[PDB]
């Protein structure tokens, strides 16, 4: 488990080396209704279902069919012209009121970006001290190790 990240100042060759040894040990081991059916089929096939491309074109001196199609264009154009009246009445006040809401929504996210930033650096900060604590202790151990190694020889 133990591998000191901050203390071990470990080349790319060692990653490539260890990857090969890990690789060799891997060589050894080796709820909705009908809605979901049509939605998954639409996405898989990459084709959206065609809508009513009729109101836009039409034609004068048609028949009973275009008499309907004509009368459709009138009522929707009157609804359109009424739908543009209540927008222009308020105008830009309704738009800029929503623009202000979006600024309150945005700043909230970036506050959380900082809260995460601080606690993430704070955890790493605690790790750092641990790394330097033990890395010294390991240094102490190795020095003592080398002392015996030659001490035992010089006695014999």
């Amino acid at each position: 488990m133990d591998g000191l990240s901050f203390v071990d100042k470990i080349p790319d060759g060692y990653k490539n080396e260890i990857d090969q040894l890990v690789k060799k040990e891997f060589a050894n081991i080796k709820a909705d209704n009908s809605v979901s059916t049509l939605t998954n089929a639409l996405y898989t096939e990459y084709l959206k279902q065609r809508n009513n491309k009729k109101r836009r074109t039409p034609d004068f001196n048609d028949d009973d069919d275009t008499l309907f199609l004509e009368e459709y264009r009138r009522k929707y154009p009157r609804i359109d012209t009424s739908r543009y009246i209540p927008n222009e009445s308020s105008e830009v006040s309704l738009l800029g009121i929503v623009d202000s809401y979006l600024k309150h929504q945005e700043i909230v996210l970036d506050t959380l970006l900082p809260q995460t930033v601080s606690n993430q650096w704070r955890i790493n900060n605690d790790y750092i001290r641990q790394t330097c604590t033990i890395v010294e202790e390991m240094n102490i151990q190795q020095r003592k190790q080398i002392n015996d190694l030659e001490i035992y020889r010089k006695r014999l």
């Binding site: 488990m1 133990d2 605690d126 790790y127 190790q145 015996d148 001490i151």
Partner: protein, 46 residues
């Protein structure tokens, strides 16, 4: 959540790292502790 996890698994691995080397050191001390005595007994024969 990474650095949170990395903290918890690392902190336990260190004691195990050290304790191994600690016991590794204890054995090394014994060889040191005996090798002297044989040298010390060279003066007894003299």
């Amino acid at each position: 959540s990474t650095l949170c996890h990395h903290s918890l698994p690392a902190l336990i691995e260190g004691q195990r790292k050290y304790y191994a080397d600690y016991y590794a050191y204890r054995q090394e001390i014994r060889s040191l502790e005996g090798r002297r005595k044989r040298l010390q007994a060279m003066l007894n024969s003299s």
